[PDB]
Amino acid sequence: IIDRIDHLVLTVSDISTTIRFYEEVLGFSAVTFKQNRKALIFGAQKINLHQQEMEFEPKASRPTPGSADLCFITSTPINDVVSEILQAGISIVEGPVERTGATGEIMSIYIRDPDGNLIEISQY
Amino acid sequence: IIDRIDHLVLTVSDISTTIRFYEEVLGFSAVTFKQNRKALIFGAQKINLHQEPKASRPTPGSADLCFITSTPINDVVSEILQAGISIVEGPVERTGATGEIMSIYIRDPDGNLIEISQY
């Protein structure tokens, strides 16, 4: 019986650049575990980071920057989030638009991180 | 304020092969919605399957995911072996999002790395 996703690994070109984006835009918090590895903490989950040329094993069969397509749920009014994104100088790929969430309908806004990963920020 | 991951999209070579793996091994349940869209559900989250908009570089086998199980991890190891699935690594202690976990690693049909763990 699987309960939830605990974490996932993003392979990126530059960890510093990735960290700045997730902290400043999404509000995540960067930490260092296993002495020298980086992760981004949010809620009760996390995203571990692997930089190209120094990806820890085992890893995906085809580690690829910009191959992620993730949806994050926000408790912030989605229109306020839209405004926050524009004020941060981030381009809106699409949205706000209605989508199907895991447990119901959500309003989603899409942006991209430094590596091209698609980030869907949504409110139920 | 971001609360959690709701879902993510996996780009795969064959939806049917992918669904069978996640249903038979991980116990996920496949569903259809809207334009004959397919997804795998578990807990209060889901994984959408693509065989726009999307990732800048949709790539099969590029996922590295960790799922939490409430099933005794050693029983999970046995289930995996009985299913004829190769164990990449584990059981081994690893760092979870909120503490130590015991993890077992396997791969799905596309080569995605799947970490199944218990706190």
Side-chain angles (χ1 to χ4, degrees), chain A residues 12-42:
Chain A
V12 301
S13 62
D14 189 75
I15 285 180
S16 291
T17 303
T18 292
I19 287 179
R20 277 192 162 65
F21 176 79
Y22 285 90
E23 289 199 317
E24 308 192 319
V25 182
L26 286 301
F28 293 178
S29 299
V31 299
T32 303
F33 68 98
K34 258 60 182 67
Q35 179 185 61
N36 53 30
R37 308 197 184 186
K38 289 71 178 61
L40 289 162
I41 307 303
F42 63 91

PDB file of all heavy atoms in Angstrom, chain A residues 12-42:
ATOM      1  N   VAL A  12      19.708  18.990 -12.581  1.00  0.00           N
ATOM      2  CA  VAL A  12      19.820  20.349 -13.098  1.00  0.00           C
ATOM      3  C   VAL A  12      21.216  20.751 -13.565  1.00  0.00           C
ATOM      4  O   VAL A  12      22.217  20.150 -13.168  1.00  0.00           O
ATOM      5  CB  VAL A  12      19.340  21.354 -12.021  1.00  0.00           C
ATOM      6  CG1 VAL A  12      17.897  21.046 -11.638  1.00  0.00           C
ATOM      7  CG2 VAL A  12      20.232  21.273 -10.793  1.00  0.00           C
ATOM      8  N   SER A  13      21.280  21.772 -14.416  1.00  0.00           N
ATOM      9  CA  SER A  13      22.571  22.239 -14.916  1.00  0.00           C
ATOM     10  C   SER A  13      23.355  22.990 -13.841  1.00  0.00           C
ATOM     11  O   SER A  13      24.575  22.838 -13.730  1.00  0.00           O
ATOM     12  CB  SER A  13      22.380  23.126 -16.156  1.00  0.00           C
ATOM     13  OG  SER A  13      21.622  24.287 -15.868  1.00  0.00           O
ATOM     14  N   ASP A  14      22.655  23.786 -13.039  1.00  0.00           N
ATOM     15  CA  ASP A  14      23.302  24.555 -11.981  1.00  0.00           C
ATOM     16  C   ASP A  14      22.442  24.615 -10.717  1.00  0.00           C
ATOM     17  O   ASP A  14      21.421  25.304 -10.674  1.00  0.00           O
ATOM     18  CB  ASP A  14      23.590  25.975 -12.468  1.00  0.00           C
ATOM     19  CG  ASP A  14      24.449  26.753 -11.494  1.00  0.00           C
ATOM     20  OD1 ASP A  14      25.669  26.489 -11.434  1.00  0.00           O
ATOM     21  OD2 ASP A  14      23.905  27.611 -10.773  1.00  0.00           O
ATOM     22  N   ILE A  15      22.870  23.895  -9.688  1.00  0.00           N
ATOM     23  CA  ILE A  15      22.136  23.857  -8.435  1.00  0.00           C
ATOM     24  C   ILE A  15      21.902  25.245  -7.831  1.00  0.00           C
ATOM     25  O   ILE A  15      20.803  25.531  -7.357  1.00  0.00           O
ATOM     26  CB  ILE A  15      22.844  22.914  -7.426  1.00  0.00           C
ATOM     27  CG1 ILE A  15      22.575  21.459  -7.831  1.00  0.00           C
ATOM     28  CG2 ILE A  15      22.369  23.196  -6.004  1.00  0.00           C
ATOM     29  CD1 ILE A  15      23.211  20.411  -6.935  1.00  0.00           C
ATOM     30  N   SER A  16      22.911  26.115  -7.862  1.00  0.00           N
ATOM     31  CA  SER A  16      22.750  27.460  -7.302  1.00  0.00           C
ATOM     32  C   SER A  16      21.583  28.207  -7.941  1.00  0.00           C
ATOM     33  O   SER A  16      20.767  28.827  -7.252  1.00  0.00           O
ATOM     34  CB  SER A  16      24.034  28.280  -7.479  1.00  0.00           C
ATOM     35  OG  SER A  16      25.073  27.767  -6.668  1.00  0.00           O
ATOM     36  N   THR A  17      21.510  28.144  -9.266  1.00  0.00           N
ATOM     37  CA  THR A  17      20.451  28.811 -10.013  1.00  0.00           C
ATOM     38  C   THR A  17      19.081  28.213  -9.696  1.00  0.00           C
ATOM     39  O   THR A  17      18.090  28.935  -9.553  1.00  0.00           O
ATOM     40  CB  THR A  17      20.714  28.706 -11.524  1.00  0.00           C
ATOM     41  OG1 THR A  17      21.999  29.271 -11.823  1.00  0.00           O
ATOM     42  CG2 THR A  17      19.652  29.445 -12.300  1.00  0.00           C
ATOM     43  N   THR A  18      19.035  26.891  -9.588  1.00  0.00           N
ATOM     44  CA  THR A  18      17.799  26.186  -9.280  1.00  0.00           C
ATOM     45  C   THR A  18      17.312  26.570  -7.891  1.00  0.00           C
ATOM     46  O   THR A  18      16.126  26.857  -7.691  1.00  0.00           O
ATOM     47  CB  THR A  18      18.021  24.660  -9.365  1.00  0.00           C
ATOM     48  OG1 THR A  18      18.252  24.295 -10.729  1.00  0.00           O
ATOM     49  CG2 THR A  18      16.818  23.897  -8.834  1.00  0.00           C
ATOM     50  N   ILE A  19      18.231  26.587  -6.931  1.00  0.00           N
ATOM     51  CA  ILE A  19      17.882  26.933  -5.561  1.00  0.00           C
ATOM     52  C   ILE A  19      17.295  28.338  -5.491  1.00  0.00           C
ATOM     53  O   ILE A  19      16.259  28.557  -4.858  1.00  0.00           O
ATOM     54  CB  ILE A  19      19.119  26.811  -4.631  1.00  0.00           C
ATOM     55  CG1 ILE A  19      19.435  25.323  -4.397  1.00  0.00           C
ATOM     56  CG2 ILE A  19      18.861  27.535  -3.299  1.00  0.00           C
ATOM     57  CD1 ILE A  19      20.658  25.052  -3.515  1.00  0.00           C
ATOM     58  N   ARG A  20      17.944  29.294  -6.146  1.00  0.00           N
ATOM     59  CA  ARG A  20      17.442  30.664  -6.126  1.00  0.00           C
ATOM     60  C   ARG A  20      16.010  30.759  -6.642  1.00  0.00           C
ATOM     61  O   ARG A  20      15.182  31.468  -6.072  1.00  0.00           O
ATOM     62  CB  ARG A  20      18.358  31.586  -6.934  1.00  0.00           C
ATOM     63  CG  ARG A  20      19.573  32.075  -6.162  1.00  0.00           C
ATOM     64  CD  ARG A  20      20.274  33.215  -6.899  1.00  0.00           C
ATOM     65  NE  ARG A  20      21.159  33.979  -6.019  1.00  0.00           N
ATOM     66  CZ  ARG A  20      22.247  33.491  -5.431  1.00  0.00           C
ATOM     67  NH1 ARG A  20      22.605  32.227  -5.622  1.00  0.00           N
ATOM     68  NH2 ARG A  20      22.982  34.273  -4.650  1.00  0.00           N
ATOM     69  N   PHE A  21      15.709  30.033  -7.713  1.00  0.00           N
ATOM     70  CA  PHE A  21      14.365  30.046  -8.279  1.00  0.00           C
ATOM     71  C   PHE A  21      13.326  29.471  -7.311  1.00  0.00           C
ATOM     72  O   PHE A  21      12.319  30.125  -7.008  1.00  0.00           O
ATOM     73  CB  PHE A  21      14.325  29.243  -9.583  1.00  0.00           C
ATOM     74  CG  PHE A  21      12.945  29.123 -10.176  1.00  0.00           C
ATOM     75  CD1 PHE A  21      12.388  30.176 -10.898  1.00  0.00           C
ATOM     76  CD2 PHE A  21      12.195  27.959 -10.000  1.00  0.00           C
ATOM     77  CE1 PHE A  21      11.103  30.070 -11.443  1.00  0.00           C
ATOM     78  CE2 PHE A  21      10.906  27.840 -10.538  1.00  0.00           C
ATOM     79  CZ  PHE A  21      10.359  28.900 -11.263  1.00  0.00           C
ATOM     80  N   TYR A  22      13.567  28.261  -6.811  1.00  0.00           N
ATOM     81  CA  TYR A  22      12.598  27.646  -5.911  1.00  0.00           C
ATOM     82  C   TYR A  22      12.429  28.375  -4.585  1.00  0.00           C
ATOM     83  O   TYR A  22      11.331  28.402  -4.024  1.00  0.00           O
ATOM     84  CB  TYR A  22      12.926  26.158  -5.699  1.00  0.00           C
ATOM     85  CG  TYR A  22      12.545  25.320  -6.905  1.00  0.00           C
ATOM     86  CD1 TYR A  22      13.448  25.101  -7.943  1.00  0.00           C
ATOM     87  CD2 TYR A  22      11.250  24.811  -7.045  1.00  0.00           C
ATOM     88  CE1 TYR A  22      13.078  24.399  -9.094  1.00  0.00           C
ATOM     89  CE2 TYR A  22      10.865  24.113  -8.195  1.00  0.00           C
ATOM     90  CZ  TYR A  22      11.780  23.913  -9.215  1.00  0.00           C
ATOM     91  OH  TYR A  22      11.385  23.249 -10.357  1.00  0.00           O
ATOM     92  N   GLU A  23      13.497  28.980  -4.078  1.00  0.00           N
ATOM     93  CA  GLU A  23      13.367  29.724  -2.833  1.00  0.00           C
ATOM     94  C   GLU A  23      12.635  31.049  -3.059  1.00  0.00           C
ATOM     95  O   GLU A  23      11.651  31.339  -2.383  1.00  0.00           O
ATOM     96  CB  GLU A  23      14.735  30.001  -2.205  1.00  0.00           C
ATOM     97  CG  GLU A  23      15.421  28.772  -1.628  1.00  0.00           C
ATOM     98  CD  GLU A  23      16.519  29.124  -0.631  1.00  0.00           C
ATOM     99  OE1 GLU A  23      17.308  30.056  -0.906  1.00  0.00           O
ATOM    100  OE2 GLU A  23      16.598  28.465   0.427  1.00  0.00           O
ATOM    101  N   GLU A  24      13.095  31.838  -4.027  1.00  0.00           N
ATOM    102  CA  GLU A  24      12.497  33.149  -4.281  1.00  0.00           C
ATOM    103  C   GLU A  24      11.092  33.132  -4.869  1.00  0.00           C
ATOM    104  O   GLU A  24      10.249  33.948  -4.490  1.00  0.00           O
ATOM    105  CB  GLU A  24      13.418  33.989  -5.176  1.00  0.00           C
ATOM    106  CG  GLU A  24      14.844  34.083  -4.660  1.00  0.00           C
ATOM    107  CD  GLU A  24      15.675  35.128  -5.378  1.00  0.00           C
ATOM    108  OE1 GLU A  24      15.563  35.244  -6.618  1.00  0.00           O
ATOM    109  OE2 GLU A  24      16.455  35.827  -4.699  1.00  0.00           O
ATOM    110  N   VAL A  25      10.829  32.209  -5.785  1.00  0.00           N
ATOM    111  CA  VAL A  25       9.517  32.142  -6.413  1.00  0.00           C
ATOM    112  C   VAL A  25       8.510  31.254  -5.678  1.00  0.00           C
ATOM    113  O   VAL A  25       7.445  31.724  -5.263  1.00  0.00           O
ATOM    114  CB  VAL A  25       9.646  31.666  -7.872  1.00  0.00           C
ATOM    115  CG1 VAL A  25       8.280  31.640  -8.534  1.00  0.00           C
ATOM    116  CG2 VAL A  25      10.603  32.588  -8.627  1.00  0.00           C
ATOM    117  N   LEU A  26       8.844  29.976  -5.506  1.00  0.00           N
ATOM    118  CA  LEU A  26       7.944  29.039  -4.837  1.00  0.00           C
ATOM    119  C   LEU A  26       8.000  29.065  -3.314  1.00  0.00           C
ATOM    120  O   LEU A  26       7.170  28.447  -2.653  1.00  0.00           O
ATOM    121  CB  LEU A  26       8.209  27.608  -5.322  1.00  0.00           C
ATOM    122  CG  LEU A  26       7.741  27.208  -6.727  1.00  0.00           C
ATOM    123  CD1 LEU A  26       6.238  27.394  -6.827  1.00  0.00           C
ATOM    124  CD2 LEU A  26       8.444  28.035  -7.782  1.00  0.00           C
ATOM    125  N   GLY A  27       8.981  29.761  -2.752  1.00  0.00           N
ATOM    126  CA  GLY A  27       9.077  29.829  -1.304  1.00  0.00           C
ATOM    127  C   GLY A  27       9.615  28.592  -0.614  1.00  0.00           C
ATOM    128  O   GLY A  27       9.411  28.414   0.591  1.00  0.00           O
ATOM    129  N   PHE A  28      10.294  27.722  -1.355  1.00  0.00           N
ATOM    130  CA  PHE A  28      10.869  26.519  -0.750  1.00  0.00           C
ATOM    131  C   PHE A  28      12.095  26.898   0.086  1.00  0.00           C
ATOM    132  O   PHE A  28      12.590  28.026   0.003  1.00  0.00           O
ATOM    133  CB  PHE A  28      11.297  25.522  -1.832  1.00  0.00           C
ATOM    134  CG  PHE A  28      10.154  24.929  -2.617  1.00  0.00           C
ATOM    135  CD1 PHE A  28      10.412  24.035  -3.648  1.00  0.00           C
ATOM    136  CD2 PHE A  28       8.828  25.241  -2.321  1.00  0.00           C
ATOM    137  CE1 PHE A  28       9.373  23.453  -4.380  1.00  0.00           C
ATOM    138  CE2 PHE A  28       7.782  24.662  -3.049  1.00  0.00           C
ATOM    139  CZ  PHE A  28       8.056  23.767  -4.078  1.00  0.00           C
ATOM    140  N   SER A  29      12.594  25.954   0.876  1.00  0.00           N
ATOM    141  CA  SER A  29      13.765  26.205   1.715  1.00  0.00           C
ATOM    142  C   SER A  29      14.870  25.196   1.420  1.00  0.00           C
ATOM    143  O   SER A  29      14.672  23.992   1.574  1.00  0.00           O
ATOM    144  CB  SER A  29      13.395  26.129   3.198  1.00  0.00           C
ATOM    145  OG  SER A  29      12.428  27.108   3.534  1.00  0.00           O
ATOM    146  N   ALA A  30      16.032  25.688   1.006  1.00  0.00           N
ATOM    147  CA  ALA A  30      17.152  24.807   0.690  1.00  0.00           C
ATOM    148  C   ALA A  30      17.901  24.321   1.927  1.00  0.00           C
ATOM    149  O   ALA A  30      18.084  25.066   2.895  1.00  0.00           O
ATOM    150  CB  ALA A  30      18.127  25.510  -0.268  1.00  0.00           C
ATOM    151  N   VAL A  31      18.321  23.059   1.893  1.00  0.00           N
ATOM    152  CA  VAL A  31      19.081  22.464   2.990  1.00  0.00           C
ATOM    153  C   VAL A  31      20.172  21.579   2.412  1.00  0.00           C
ATOM    154  O   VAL A  31      20.168  21.270   1.216  1.00  0.00           O
ATOM    155  CB  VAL A  31      18.211  21.578   3.904  1.00  0.00           C
ATOM    156  CG1 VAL A  31      17.110  22.402   4.544  1.00  0.00           C
ATOM    157  CG2 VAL A  31      17.642  20.408   3.111  1.00  0.00           C
ATOM    158  N   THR A  32      21.102  21.174   3.269  1.00  0.00           N
ATOM    159  CA  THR A  32      22.199  20.310   2.864  1.00  0.00           C
ATOM    160  C   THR A  32      22.156  19.060   3.732  1.00  0.00           C
ATOM    161  O   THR A  32      22.223  19.151   4.959  1.00  0.00           O
ATOM    162  CB  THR A  32      23.561  21.005   3.059  1.00  0.00           C
ATOM    163  OG1 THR A  32      23.583  22.230   2.319  1.00  0.00           O
ATOM    164  CG2 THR A  32      24.696  20.108   2.570  1.00  0.00           C
ATOM    165  N   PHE A  33      22.022  17.901   3.095  1.00  0.00           N
ATOM    166  CA  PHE A  33      21.981  16.633   3.809  1.00  0.00           C
ATOM    167  C   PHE A  33      23.107  15.738   3.301  1.00  0.00           C
ATOM    168  O   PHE A  33      23.706  16.015   2.262  1.00  0.00           O
ATOM    169  CB  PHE A  33      20.615  15.955   3.626  1.00  0.00           C
ATOM    170  CG  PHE A  33      20.347  15.473   2.229  1.00  0.00           C
ATOM    171  CD1 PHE A  33      20.555  14.141   1.892  1.00  0.00           C
ATOM    172  CD2 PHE A  33      19.854  16.343   1.256  1.00  0.00           C
ATOM    173  CE1 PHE A  33      20.276  13.672   0.614  1.00  0.00           C
ATOM    174  CE2 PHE A  33      19.569  15.883  -0.034  1.00  0.00           C
ATOM    175  CZ  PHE A  33      19.780  14.542  -0.352  1.00  0.00           C
ATOM    176  N   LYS A  34      23.391  14.667   4.035  1.00  0.00           N
ATOM    177  CA  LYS A  34      24.468  13.762   3.656  1.00  0.00           C
ATOM    178  C   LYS A  34      25.751  14.553   3.411  1.00  0.00           C
ATOM    179  O   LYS A  34      26.481  14.297   2.457  1.00  0.00           O
ATOM    180  CB  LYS A  34      24.093  12.966   2.404  1.00  0.00           C
ATOM    181  CG  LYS A  34      23.662  11.533   2.685  1.00  0.00           C
ATOM    182  CD  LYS A  34      22.441  11.470   3.589  1.00  0.00           C
ATOM    183  CE  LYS A  34      22.057  10.029   3.902  1.00  0.00           C
ATOM    184  NZ  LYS A  34      23.073   9.331   4.742  1.00  0.00           N
ATOM    185  N   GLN A  35      25.993  15.530   4.281  1.00  0.00           N
ATOM    186  CA  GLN A  35      27.179  16.385   4.241  1.00  0.00           C
ATOM    187  C   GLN A  35      27.324  17.407   3.115  1.00  0.00           C
ATOM    188  O   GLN A  35      27.741  18.539   3.362  1.00  0.00           O
ATOM    189  CB  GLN A  35      28.453  15.528   4.273  1.00  0.00           C
ATOM    190  CG  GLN A  35      29.732  16.360   4.207  1.00  0.00           C
ATOM    191  CD  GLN A  35      30.994  15.518   4.105  1.00  0.00           C
ATOM    192  OE1 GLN A  35      31.177  14.752   3.154  1.00  0.00           O
ATOM    193  NE2 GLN A  35      31.877  15.661   5.086  1.00  0.00           N
ATOM    194  N   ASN A  36      26.991  17.029   1.884  1.00  0.00           N
ATOM    195  CA  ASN A  36      27.167  17.946   0.762  1.00  0.00           C
ATOM    196  C   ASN A  36      26.082  17.924  -0.317  1.00  0.00           C
ATOM    197  O   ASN A  36      26.275  18.482  -1.395  1.00  0.00           O
ATOM    198  CB  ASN A  36      28.513  17.663   0.093  1.00  0.00           C
ATOM    199  CG  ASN A  36      28.669  16.197  -0.272  1.00  0.00           C
ATOM    200  OD1 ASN A  36      27.683  15.517  -0.557  1.00  0.00           O
ATOM    201  ND2 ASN A  36      29.901  15.707  -0.270  1.00  0.00           N
ATOM    202  N   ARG A  37      24.948  17.295  -0.038  1.00  0.00           N
ATOM    203  CA  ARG A  37      23.878  17.228  -1.027  1.00  0.00           C
ATOM    204  C   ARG A  37      22.818  18.282  -0.755  1.00  0.00           C
ATOM    205  O   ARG A  37      22.577  18.641   0.398  1.00  0.00           O
ATOM    206  CB  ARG A  37      23.251  15.838  -1.017  1.00  0.00           C
ATOM    207  CG  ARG A  37      24.279  14.725  -1.158  1.00  0.00           C
ATOM    208  CD  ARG A  37      23.614  13.445  -1.550  1.00  0.00           C
ATOM    209  NE  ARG A  37      24.557  12.335  -1.592  1.00  0.00           N
ATOM    210  CZ  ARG A  37      24.237  11.120  -2.013  1.00  0.00           C
ATOM    211  NH1 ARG A  37      23.000  10.878  -2.434  1.00  0.00           N
ATOM    212  NH2 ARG A  37      25.141  10.144  -1.994  1.00  0.00           N
ATOM    213  N   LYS A  38      22.186  18.773  -1.817  1.00  0.00           N
ATOM    214  CA  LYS A  38      21.160  19.801  -1.687  1.00  0.00           C
ATOM    215  C   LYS A  38      19.742  19.300  -1.903  1.00  0.00           C
ATOM    216  O   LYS A  38      19.491  18.423  -2.740  1.00  0.00           O
ATOM    217  CB  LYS A  38      21.412  20.939  -2.678  1.00  0.00           C
ATOM    218  CG  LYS A  38      22.600  21.824  -2.351  1.00  0.00           C
ATOM    219  CD  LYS A  38      23.914  21.125  -2.570  1.00  0.00           C
ATOM    220  CE  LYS A  38      25.055  22.080  -2.261  1.00  0.00           C
ATOM    221  NZ  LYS A  38      25.031  22.532  -0.839  1.00  0.00           N
ATOM    222  N   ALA A  39      18.817  19.870  -1.138  1.00  0.00           N
ATOM    223  CA  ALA A  39      17.405  19.546  -1.250  1.00  0.00           C
ATOM    224  C   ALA A  39      16.598  20.812  -1.004  1.00  0.00           C
ATOM    225  O   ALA A  39      17.093  21.788  -0.428  1.00  0.00           O
ATOM    226  CB  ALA A  39      17.018  18.471  -0.248  1.00  0.00           C
ATOM    227  N   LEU A  40      15.360  20.792  -1.471  1.00  0.00           N
ATOM    228  CA  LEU A  40      14.445  21.906  -1.302  1.00  0.00           C
ATOM    229  C   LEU A  40      13.272  21.351  -0.522  1.00  0.00           C
ATOM    230  O   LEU A  40      12.571  20.449  -0.984  1.00  0.00           O
ATOM    231  CB  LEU A  40      13.976  22.428  -2.659  1.00  0.00           C
ATOM    232  CG  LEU A  40      15.053  23.168  -3.461  1.00  0.00           C
ATOM    233  CD1 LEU A  40      14.635  23.255  -4.915  1.00  0.00           C
ATOM    234  CD2 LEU A  40      15.285  24.554  -2.862  1.00  0.00           C
ATOM    235  N   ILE A  41      13.090  21.885   0.680  1.00  0.00           N
ATOM    236  CA  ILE A  41      12.026  21.471   1.577  1.00  0.00           C
ATOM    237  C   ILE A  41      10.752  22.285   1.368  1.00  0.00           C
ATOM    238  O   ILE A  41      10.809  23.501   1.205  1.00  0.00           O
ATOM    239  CB  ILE A  41      12.460  21.669   3.055  1.00  0.00           C
ATOM    240  CG1 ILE A  41      13.801  20.972   3.308  1.00  0.00           C
ATOM    241  CG2 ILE A  41      11.366  21.204   3.995  1.00  0.00           C
ATOM    242  CD1 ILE A  41      13.806  19.499   2.988  1.00  0.00           C
ATOM    243  N   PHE A  42       9.607  21.606   1.371  1.00  0.00           N
ATOM    244  CA  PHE A  42       8.307  22.264   1.258  1.00  0.00           C
ATOM    245  C   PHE A  42       7.276  21.317   1.849  1.00  0.00           C
ATOM    246  O   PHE A  42       7.348  20.109   1.638  1.00  0.00           O
ATOM    247  CB  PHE A  42       7.973  22.615  -0.202  1.00  0.00           C
ATOM    248  CG  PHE A  42       7.840  21.431  -1.102  1.00  0.00           C
ATOM    249  CD1 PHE A  42       6.603  20.820  -1.296  1.00  0.00           C
ATOM    250  CD2 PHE A  42       8.951  20.925  -1.767  1.00  0.00           C
ATOM    251  CE1 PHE A  42       6.478  19.724  -2.139  1.00  0.00           C
ATOM    252  CE2 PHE A  42       8.833  19.827  -2.612  1.00  0.00           C
ATOM    253  CZ  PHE A  42       7.597  19.226  -2.800  1.00  0.00           C
TER     254      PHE A  42
END
